[PDB]
Amino acid sequence: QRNEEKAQREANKKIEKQLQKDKQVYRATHRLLLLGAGESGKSTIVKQMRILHVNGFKATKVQDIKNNLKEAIETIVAAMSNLVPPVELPENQFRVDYILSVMNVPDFDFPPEFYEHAKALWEDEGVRACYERSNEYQLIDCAQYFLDKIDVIKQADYVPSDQDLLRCRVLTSGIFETKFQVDKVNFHMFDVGGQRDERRKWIQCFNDVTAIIFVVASSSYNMVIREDNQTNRLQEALNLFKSIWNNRWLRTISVILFLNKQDLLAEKVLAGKSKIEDYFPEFARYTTPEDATPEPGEDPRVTRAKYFIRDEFLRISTASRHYCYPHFTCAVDTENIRRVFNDCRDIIQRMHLRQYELL
Amino acid sequence: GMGIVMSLIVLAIVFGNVLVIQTVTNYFITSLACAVPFGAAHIWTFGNFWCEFWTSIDVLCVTASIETLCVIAVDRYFAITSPFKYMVWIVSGLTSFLPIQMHWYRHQEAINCYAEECDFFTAIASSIVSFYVPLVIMVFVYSRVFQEAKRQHKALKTLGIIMGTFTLCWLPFFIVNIVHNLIRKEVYILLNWIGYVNSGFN
Amino acid sequence: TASIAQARKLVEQLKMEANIDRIKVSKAAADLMAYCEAHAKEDPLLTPVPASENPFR
Amino acid sequence: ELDQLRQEAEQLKNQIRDARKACADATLSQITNNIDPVGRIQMRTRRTLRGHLAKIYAMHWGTDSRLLVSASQDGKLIIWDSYTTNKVHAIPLRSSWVMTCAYAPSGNYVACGGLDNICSIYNLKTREGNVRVSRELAGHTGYLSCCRFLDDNQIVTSSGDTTCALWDIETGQQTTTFTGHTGDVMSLSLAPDTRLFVSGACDASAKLWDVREGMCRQTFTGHESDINAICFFPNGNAFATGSDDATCRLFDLRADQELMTYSHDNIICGITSVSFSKSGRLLLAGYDDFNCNVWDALKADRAGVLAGHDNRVSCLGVTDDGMAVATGSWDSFLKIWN
Ligand SMILES: Nc1nc2c(ncn2[C@@H]2O[C@H](COP(=O)(O)OP(=O)(O)OP(=O)(O)O)[C@@H](O)[C@H]2O)c(=O)[nH]1
Numbered sequence: 004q005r006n007e008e009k010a011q012r013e014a015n016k017k018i019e020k021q022l023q024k025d026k027q028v029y030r031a032t033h034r035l036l037l038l039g040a041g042e043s044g045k046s047t048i049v050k051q052m053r054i055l056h057v058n059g060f061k062a063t064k065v066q067d068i069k070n071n072l073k074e075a076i077e078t079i080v081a082a083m084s085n086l087v088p089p090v091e092l093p094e095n096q097f098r099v100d101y102i103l104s105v106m107n108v109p110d111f112d113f114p115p116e117f118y119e120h121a122k123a124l125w126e127d128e129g130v131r132a133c134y135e136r137s138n139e140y141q142l143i144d145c146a147q148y149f150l151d152k153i154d155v156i157k158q159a160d161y162v163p164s165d166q167d168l169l170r171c172r173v174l175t176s177g178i179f180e181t182k183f184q185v186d187k188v189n190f191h192m193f194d195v196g197g198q199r200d201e202r203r204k205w206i207q208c209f210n211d212v213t214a215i216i217f218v219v220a221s222s223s224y225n226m227v228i229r230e231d232n233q234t235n236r237l238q239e240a241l242n243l244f245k246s247i248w249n250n251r252w253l254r255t256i257s258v259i260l261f262l263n264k265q266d267l268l269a270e271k272v273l274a275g276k277s278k279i280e281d282y283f284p285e286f287a288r289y290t291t292p293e294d295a296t297p298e299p300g301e302d303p304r305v306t307r308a309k310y311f312i313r314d315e316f317l318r319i320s321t322a323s324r325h326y327c328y329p330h331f332t333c334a335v336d337t338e339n340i341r342r343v344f345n346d347c348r349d350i351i352q353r354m355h356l357r358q359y360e361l362l
Numbered sequence: 363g364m365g366i367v368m369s370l371i372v373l374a375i376v377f378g379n380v381l382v383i384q385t386v387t388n389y390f391i392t393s394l395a396c397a398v399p400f401g402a403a404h405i406w407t408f409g410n411f412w413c414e415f416w417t418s419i420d421v422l423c424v425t426a427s428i429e430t431l432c433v434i435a436v437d438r439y440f441a442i443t444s445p446f447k448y449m450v451w452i453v454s455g456l457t458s459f460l461p462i463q464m465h466w467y468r469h470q471e472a473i474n475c476y477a478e479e480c481d482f483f484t485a486i487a488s489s490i491v492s493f494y495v496p497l498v499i500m501v502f503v504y505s506r507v508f509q510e511a512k513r514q515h516k517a518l519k520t521l522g523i524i525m526g527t528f529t530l531c532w533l534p535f536f537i538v539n540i541v542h543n544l545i546r547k548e549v550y551i552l553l554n555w556i557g558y559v560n561s562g563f564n
Numbered sequence: 565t566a567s568i569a570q571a572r573k574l575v576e577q578l579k580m581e582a583n584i585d586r587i588k589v590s591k592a593a594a595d596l597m598a599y600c601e602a603h604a605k606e607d608p609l610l611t612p613v614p615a616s617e618n619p620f621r
Numbered sequence: 622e623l624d625q626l627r628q629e630a631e632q633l634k635n636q637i638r639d640a641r642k643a644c645a646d647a648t649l650s651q652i653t654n655n656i657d658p659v660g661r662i663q664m665r666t667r668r669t670l671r672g673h674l675a676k677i678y679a680m681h682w683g684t685d686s687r688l689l690v691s692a693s694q695d696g697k698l699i700i701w702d703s704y705t706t707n708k709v710h711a712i713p714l715r716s717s718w719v720m721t722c723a724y725a726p727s728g729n730y731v732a733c734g735g736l737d738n739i740c741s742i743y744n745l746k747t748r749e750g751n752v753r754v755s756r757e758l759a760g761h762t763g764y765l766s767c768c769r770f771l772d773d774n775q776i777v778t779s780s781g782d783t784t785c786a787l788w789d790i791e792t793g794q795q796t797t798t799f800t801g802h803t804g805d806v807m808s809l810s811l812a813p814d815t816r817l818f819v820s821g822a823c824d825a826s827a828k829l830w831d832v833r834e835g836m837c838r839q840t841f842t843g844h845e846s847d848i849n850a851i852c853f854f855p856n857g858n859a860f861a862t863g864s865d866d867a868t869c870r871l872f873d874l875r876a877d878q879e880l881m882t883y884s885h886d887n888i889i890c891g892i893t894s895v896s897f898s899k900s901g902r903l904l905l906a907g908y909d910d911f912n913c914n915v916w917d918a919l920k921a922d923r924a925g926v927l928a929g930h931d932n933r934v935s936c937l938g939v940t941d942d943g944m945a946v947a948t949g950s951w952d953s954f955l956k957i958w959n
Pocket residue numbers: 040041042043044045046047048144145169170171172173174175196197263264265266267332333334335
């Protein structure tokens with residue numbers, strides 16, 4: 004009958020009205036895609052945005068700190084003997100095998116008997132001697148900030164602060180999105196993924212994002228990638244950056260560059276030990292460019308090192324529509340992301356290429 | 363036979379606009395480009411009331427084009443200036459075509475010209491409003507845009523075609539209109555004759 | 565070595581793929597031609613459909 | 622040791638190749654060179670479907686050949702009506718990234734995968750006339766690439782971690798698991814009798830599993846690049862594979878050998894999706910140069926071109942009765958041919 008036709012037309016009208024209402028909100032959002040290498044700081048920024056531009060943001064989050072504490076102290080003791088030169092310290096000898104005994108078990112030593120004597124190893128000179136040289140083995144980058152603050156949170160949950168929550172490292176299960184609220188149209192920032200893949204077939208989907216944010220570490224110029232003895236952790240980022248730029252799918256997409264771990268880089272150069280020239284041979288002849296604006300908080304020696312790293316990345320971009328932007332960031336300091344954030348916004352696609360009318 | 367060559371020349375103008383005949387900014391330009399046969403007149407006016415309609419249509423088209431270009435320039439400049447953005451056609455013609463057919467006009471010999479069945483005599487205020495008001499906004503909006511490029515060659519090269527073409531095509535006509543003597547009656551037609559070439563530019 | 569264990573499993577599965585019966589291509593290809601000739605009538609994409617018969621027109 | 626194992630493995634590859642040579646008697650063209658070509662094929666757009674905002678990545682025809690479901694890049698599944706173009710539903714999605722869709726043979730459930738590793742399933746006909754999530758499957762790693770229905774309570778998925786698993790909606794756990802690929806899996810297609818299925822990986826290879834026992838049976842490797850789509854011949858004894866390079870090849874189960882190569886010297890683009898016709902006489906194939914082509918199963922010549930989409934075809938399908946052909950694209954437009 005015609006009643007069925009009338010009902011279908013009414014349903015089509017309702018669906019069309021819903022589609023028309025929903026179309027407007029999609030045409031205004033700006034989407035940003037994070038990128039980088041393994042253990043670089045991508046997920047830290049996403050958590051940082053929530054704690055800054057969103058009022059919102061517990062017991063489960065407390066448990067992973069204890070899990071992190073069990074791993075950080077295990078690696079240092081395990082590599083004491085496995086290190087090629089002997090670096091062994093007789094204190095806590097009866098605990099050394101205890102660490103090896105509990106080094107592999109699904110259930111951690113929840114009893115406080117573990118915490119009382121593991122603190123002695125931290126105070127022991129033998130463990131501190133191994134911690135001085137950490138280039139040979141692989142160690143979590145947040146080990147020191149957690150070992151010192153031991154038993155402050157072991158007594159009870161004690162609602163650990165955000166500063167002690169951001170530094171916690173948790174593997175990415177899948178995609179990790181966030182839609183914060185801003186006076187302009189709300190943005191859609193999403194993490195790249197969980198596991199590193201060389202082929203990267205899914206990148207063909209991302210062909211409409213306004214900007215691509217690239218995050219690279221700077222305090223790792225003398226450590227190998229997770230797969231041992233592969234290459235310098237900085238060189239593995241250089242090869243990835245070159246591949247991203249020379250990609251068929253990404254032909255008209257801008258790139259924003261972040262150089263995190265500035266504080267870690269500052270402490271490494273100051274306290275001698277390994278030098279840039281030993282690992283990078285072309286650093287000796289470098290001269291600091293005149294067009295430099297160092298911030299008034301660094302001695303002239305370290306400032307010579309920051310611009311060499313930037314020069315290596317930027318040389319790749321200028322060889323080959325596409326533009327690149329350099330920046331210096333330290334993700335943990337809450338204020339620093341905002342200072343770039345309230346700045347990043349102003350020029351990109353903002354009076355820059357904004358003027359798409361033929362000039 | 364010179365006019366016949368021009369008759370085919372102005373005939374070729376329609377093809378360019380017809381060939382063009384999509385976004386938010388492109389919607390405005392559709393009417394601007396879309397918006398003369400009686401030029402020869404054997405050196406016409408079959409109907410006495412028919413002559414007034416041609417002049418009214420010409421004036422309305424001119425003011426509509428000026429208003430449309432003003433609107434598009436202002437919109438583009440405002441869009442460029444402010445990141446993250448969030449009825450003239452009827453109005454201009456309403457106040458322009460009405461006096462033409464409303465017996466709103468202006469010598470003893472002049473009345474004789476109306477008595478004999480294509481004299482043009484008069485509406486400068488429609489003029490100053492039609493051209494001077496639009497140009498003043500048009501220079502200002504463009505002036506901000508050039509500085510934005512300077513903050514961050516080709517810009518001046520395109521801006522020349524954007525502005526100077528219309529300026530040279532129209533401002534001398536405005537100067538001729540304000541002259542109304544020392545201007546030949548036949549000479550004035552030539553200045554307005556080149557006005558239709560602007561429609562061929564777009 | 566895990567690779568030695570991994571390689572051992574790979575070789576065992578390959579042995580099963582060697583003892584699979586096979587037939588001549590001439591008899592195999594002739595079956596495809598026979599099938600396409602049988603169902604030539606029930607295929608409106610090849611022979612254009614009448615306007616009344618087609619629900620789309 | 623390792624050297625002994627490697628030597629044994631190579632000692633079996635040459636036997637397979639030598640045995641394959643003995644099986645070949647004559648090429649396909651030689652036997653099939655005494656028939657009349659179908660000729661030029663021309664067909665126009667009967668209808669056009671509009672209402673998607675972003676690119677379409679997959680689509681599937683219903684079992685009644687009247688209703689089709691499409692999935693976009695903004696996370697919206699809408700069940701169209703082919704006859705009158707009346708959209709019936711508009712299901713939002715938790716994850717804005719989507720790569721698959723399916724339509725149950727009973728027409729009561731619609732399954733949508735995606736990059737979120739969750740192969741969620743929806744309910745169409747129920748009380749209160751709503752659509753809600755029935756179950757979410759999260760026992761799998763990597764992004765998904767295809768989903769298919771055997772019955773109302775079995776669904777098969779294939780991801781980018783070189784695995785293919787057969788789920789079960791009621792229990793919500795993997796019944797079996799198939800392993801053996803060394804590259805990303807991209808597509809699959811069940812048999813007409815629903816007893817076997819294949820899968821095209823990214824290491825220039827294809828396999829043929831068994832649903833019940835769960836073990837590999839054959840392996841074809843005639844390609845030289847990546848693989849993007851597979852479909853079965855209606856008979857069920859042959860399947861055509863579309864690869865990343867221009868070549869489209871048609872293998873045979875019984876003969877265990879490649880038969881024909883569909884390629885042209887004037888094409889250097891890729892293949893997105895392939896599908897046969899009702900009588901297995903045509904091999905429709907999508908392309909990355911903004912149009913679609915129409916090959917021939919036997920004569921291997923390009924009879925016709927469908928065109929004008931203005932963006933890459935990204936999905937394709939043919940109705941059960943062979944009365945229509947539908948394609949999607951990246952320009953948010955669906956079309957129906959006849
Ligand atoms: N001290 C310090 N630690 C940092 C800084 N940036 C990152 N980290 C630490 O580095 C680790 C980064 O972990 P995530 O946020 O998951 O980033 P990621 O390690 O690249 O992990 P994925 O993003 O999943 O690849 C954490 O331990 C952070 O606390 C920094 O500027 N200073």
